[PDB]
Every structure is written in C-alpha cells, then in structure tokens.
Amino acid sequence: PDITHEMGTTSFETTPKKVVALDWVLTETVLSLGIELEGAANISGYQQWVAEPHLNADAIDVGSRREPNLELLSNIKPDVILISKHLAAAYEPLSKIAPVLVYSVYSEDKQPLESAKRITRSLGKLFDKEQQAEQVIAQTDQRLAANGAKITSAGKAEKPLLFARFINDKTLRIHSEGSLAQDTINAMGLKNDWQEPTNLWGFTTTGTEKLAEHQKANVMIFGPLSQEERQQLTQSPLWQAMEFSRTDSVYELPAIWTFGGLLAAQRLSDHITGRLTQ
Ligand SMILES: [Fe+3]
Ligand SMILES: [Fe+3]
Ligand SMILES: [Mg+2]
Numbered sequence: 001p002d003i004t005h006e007m008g009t010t011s012f013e014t015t016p017k018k019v020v021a022l023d024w025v026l027t028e029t030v031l032s033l034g035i036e037l038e039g040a041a042n043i044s045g046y047q048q049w050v051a052e053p054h055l056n057a058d059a060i061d062v063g064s065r066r067e068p069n070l071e072l073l074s075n076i077k078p079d080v081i082l083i084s085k086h087l088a089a090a091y092e093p094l095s096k097i098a099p100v101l102v103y104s105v106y107s108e109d110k111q112p113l114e115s116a117k118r119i120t121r122s123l124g125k126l127f128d129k130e131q132q133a134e135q136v137i138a139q140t141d142q143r144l145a146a147n148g149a150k151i152t153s154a155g156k157a158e159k160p161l162l163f164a165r166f167i168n169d170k171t172l173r174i175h176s177e178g179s180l181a182q183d184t185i186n187a188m189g190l191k192n193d194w195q196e197p198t199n200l201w202g203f204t205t206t207g208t209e210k211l212a213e214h215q216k217a218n219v220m221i222f223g224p225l226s227q228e229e230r231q232q233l234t235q236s237p238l239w240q241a242m243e244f245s246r247t248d249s250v251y252e253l254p255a256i257w258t259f260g261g262l263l264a265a266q267r268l269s270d271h272i273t274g275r276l277t278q
C-alpha cells in the first residue's frame, strides 16, 4: 500500500479510482496505463499541444497547470492528485482535498526518458498496473532501437537534426541536452546539431538568425503551427535563404508534446522515422 514520491511516502489501502493530474505529462502517463482521469489541468491545451493519447470523455478541466481550481477539486473529491515539483507551492493546499503525489519528469537531472520510466513504474504500483507499466517501458525502448536501426541502415543517420519550436517571427526554442526530443533521437542513434546550453526542460530560447550556423541539419519543426505561424515561416526571407529550405530538409511534425512522456517519445520516433525513410 505505501507509495514513495518526491514529497515522501503515502499509503493507499485501495487503488485510487478518481485521479486528477495537474500537468500534461502525468496526464499522458496515467492514460498510458489504461487509467482514466476524473480531472486534468487545461484540457483545451492538452488537446492542442499533446493530442494523443486521447483524454477520456468525462474528464473535467480542473484549472490551468499553474492555478488549480481548489473549489472545483473540493466539489469533485478526488482519491489522488498528481503534480510535479514545478507546482510544489500548491502541495499543502491540495493535500487538504486529497492525497497528493509529487512526480517530476522534468528536473535538474535532465533525463526525461529515464524519469518518465521511474514515474511510469510508481504510477503502475499506485493503480495496480505494474505489468502494463513494464510493457510501456519495454515497447518504448524497442521502438527507439528498431526505428534507429532502420534510419541508420537506410543511410539517413549521418545528417544531424535541429529540433525547433516556433515562438514568434524572430524567436525559437531549440531542443537539445535534457529534452525529450534529444533523449528520443540519442536512443535512435542520431546526432543533435544544437550544442548550446539548455534549461532543465532541455531547450535554449534563441533568435532565428542562429539557424544560419546550423544549415547542414535536417530541421524538425514541432507541431501544431497556426495558419499565421506557418505563413511567417513560408514567407520569411531568413528561412528561405537557409540551405535546409533549398534542399527540402525542413519537416513540420504533428502535435507531439515537447514536454511529454514515453508515449510522446514513441510517436516522435515513429514520425521522424517516417519522414527520413519515405
Ligand atoms: Fe496551462
Ligand atoms: Fe510551456
Ligand atoms: Mg505539461
């Protein structure tokens, strides 16, 4: 019955049935184990930026990731509330409503894939889904290796990758050390063209002029992009001047969460493999 999390040890004499997750990677992880959410933070955002796996029908929006709705959470009476250390200032208030477990995929460890495995195992214990947890972990490692072997065998692993989130006309997040994207492509035997320092989420915020020092890369642009965002890239003199634009070496990915878990890594791996070996 005793579960350890980042704020100590909690006992559950029955598996918690009504589950709230207050970040999207914990939402993804709960869903990865075949468990439904009573509530999740910012469902319209999860739908836009995460997309899969699909949240269950009856899931209630319990506030923003930064501002949980305490009145609503009190009314819906969860059996467990899942947060990261990024919401630790809400630990004691949420604790008055229900048992709170603290799990952080993104920490100063900067090993998101390994953290998501550790956390998939803890939540597998919490929900009596340990076998399902071990298979999500094994299938993640299987898919990365197999996709890596395919890309390498096709002679497509030699060109380095640049992973970019569009922020505005003049601003990008480039994903490298500590990013889900980097843990994924490292496992697939690919090279990151970005070697600048990153925050604990695994990205550097940069100007778009920095792309000029990375023209030999295959550029992967995270989805989704708005019509206005995509027109800004299509029409930008800077982007159209870059070698990767002239050599058809720019790929727009679908909506896959850059701060997601094992299922995000699986989907990102599949889509990269598709684009590089089509
Ligand atoms: Fe939010
Ligand atoms: Fe964000
Ligand atoms: Mg999140």
Ligand SMILES: [Mg+2]
Residues within 6 Å of the ligand: 165, 173, 203, 222, 258
């Ligand atoms: Mg990003």
